[PDB]
Amino acid sequence: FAPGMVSQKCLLCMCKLESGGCKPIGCRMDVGSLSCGYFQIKQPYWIDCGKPGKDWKSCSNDINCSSKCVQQYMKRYATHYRCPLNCEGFAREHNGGPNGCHSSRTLKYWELLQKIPGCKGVK
Amino acid sequence: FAPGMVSQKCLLCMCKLESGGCKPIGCRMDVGSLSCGYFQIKQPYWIDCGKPGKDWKSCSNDINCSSKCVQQYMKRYATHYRCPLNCEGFAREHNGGPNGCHSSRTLKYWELLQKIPGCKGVK
Ligand SMILES: CC(=O)N[C@@H]1[C@@H](O)[C@H](O[C@@H]2O[C@H](CO)[C@@H](O[C@@H]3O[C@H](CO)[C@@H](O)[C@H](O)[C@H]3NC(C)=O)[C@H](O)[C@H]2NC(C)=O)[C@@H](CO)O[C@H]1O
Ligand SMILES: CC(=O)N[C@@H]1[C@@H](O)[C@H](O[C@@H]2O[C@H](CO)[C@@H](O[C@@H]3O[C@H](CO)[C@@H](O)[C@H](O)[C@H]3NC(C)=O)[C@H](O)[C@H]2NC(C)=O)[C@@H](CO)O[C@H]1O
Ligand SMILES: OC[C@H]1O[C@@H](O)[C@H](O)[C@@H](O)[C@@H]1O
Ligand SMILES: OC[C@H]1O[C@@H](O)[C@H](O)[C@@H](O)[C@@H]1O
Ligand SMILES: [Pt+2]
Ligand SMILES: [Pt+2]
Ligand SMILES: [Pt+2]
Ligand SMILES: [Pt+2]
Ligand SMILES: [Pt+2]
Ligand SMILES: [Pt+2]
Ligand SMILES: [Pt+2]
Ligand SMILES: [Pt+2]
Description:
The PDB classes it as hydrolase. The entry lists the keywords lysozyme, enzyme, substrate complex, hydrolase. The assembly is dimeric. Crystal Structure of Tapes japonica Lysozyme. The structure is a homodimer of 123-residue chains. Chain A has 123 residues and is mainly alpha-helical. The first copy, chain A, has a single domain, classed as Lysozyme (Orthogonal Bundle), CATH 1.10.530.10. Helices cover 47% and strands 8% of the residues of chain A. Chain A has helices spanning 8-19, 43-48, 56-60, 63-80, 87-96, 107-113, and strands at 27-30, 33-36, 41-42. The first copy, chain A, has a three-stranded antiparallel β-sheet. In chain A, strand 2 and strand 3 form a beta hairpin. The interface between A and B is medium-sized, with 19 and 21 residues. The structure holds a molecule of 3 linked components (NAG-NAG-NAG) (2 copies), beta-D-glucopyranose (2 copies) and platinum (II) ion (PT) (8 copies). One beta-D-glucopyranose binds at residues 7, 85-86, 123 of chain B. The site of one platinum (II) ion has 2 residues of chain B, from loops.
């Protein structure tokens, strides 16, 4: 995956959770909007992460572009919103948005992520 | 698995997700609570499902007892809270509690369950 603050092990866990084993699955409807690809990235997220690649959907289905987006989203928001800079923090940002790490709701996502084999207590 | 409203296919899918391939893995602390066994049953859940078997942890590590608990939990709550009585409803109850089927947070769990081999479109 693309380098950055989110660890390779953390990204792999997130990818396995979002797309069912880390696969370029395209877009699925959830909470009234489409989430796409390896990391199930929504359109506003892709806009915020600096619009990497050709476009939202093609980026989402590319392991390098989609992970670059995740890295850049965390660079933008996990820092600004003073999240813990670890997999739990990043996972909660990914699921909850710019201040997801401070929303109790995102703990269910972190719980689920750790059910993925090899992902218990990932940093 | 134990008989009841939750289909055998649904239970297998839930079991595979919860314990990394449906195994009596005992208890783990994710997010500040101990969850145990095949279906990663927490203690209040086991109390609510009618305390089947000898105790919480032994029940949780037993394929019949733990699935009996799931069945009885749904009999208690999925009915009362007017959930859809299908794998989606039951999976979301399991993930989110008595009214989990009406919480958006439990959707990620349902989305992941469906991506387990054999589990696409499970009812
Ligand atoms: C992987 C993924 O798509 N995750 C989803 C989250 O992105 C989403 O949270 C929402 O994210 C957007 C995009 O970052 C947030 O909008 C931004 O908010 C910041 C801070 O207020 C603002 O400065 C930006 O202008 C704005 N960007 C745009 C393009 O509008 C939005 O606030 C987040 N929503 C919430 C409720 O926190 C969540 C929730 O929809 O879902 C994830 O799946
Ligand atoms: C498999 C598993 O352990 N699932 C977890 C859920 O059980 C848990 O949700 C919480 O479940 C408990 C037990 O059913 C809920 O407490 C019950 O609430 C009902 C209705 O309010 C009440 O009648 C019962 O007396 C009460 N039981 C006890 C023993 O207190 C509790 O409210 C649920 N919590 C929430 C937030 O809804 C969720 C929590 O996220 O985790 C699952 O893993
Ligand atoms: O599957 C049957 C269930 O469907 C739901 O849409 C209803 O709200 C429940 O009351 C009903 O028991
Ligand atoms: O509503 C749930 C039910 O759906 C039916 O279509 C299936 O045949 C049952 O196995 C399942 O329990
Ligand atoms: Pt849609
Ligand atoms: Pt749609
Ligand atoms: Pt949004
Ligand atoms: Pt917090
Ligand atoms: Pt929770
Ligand atoms: Pt503990
Ligand atoms: Pt609880
Ligand atoms: Pt509780």
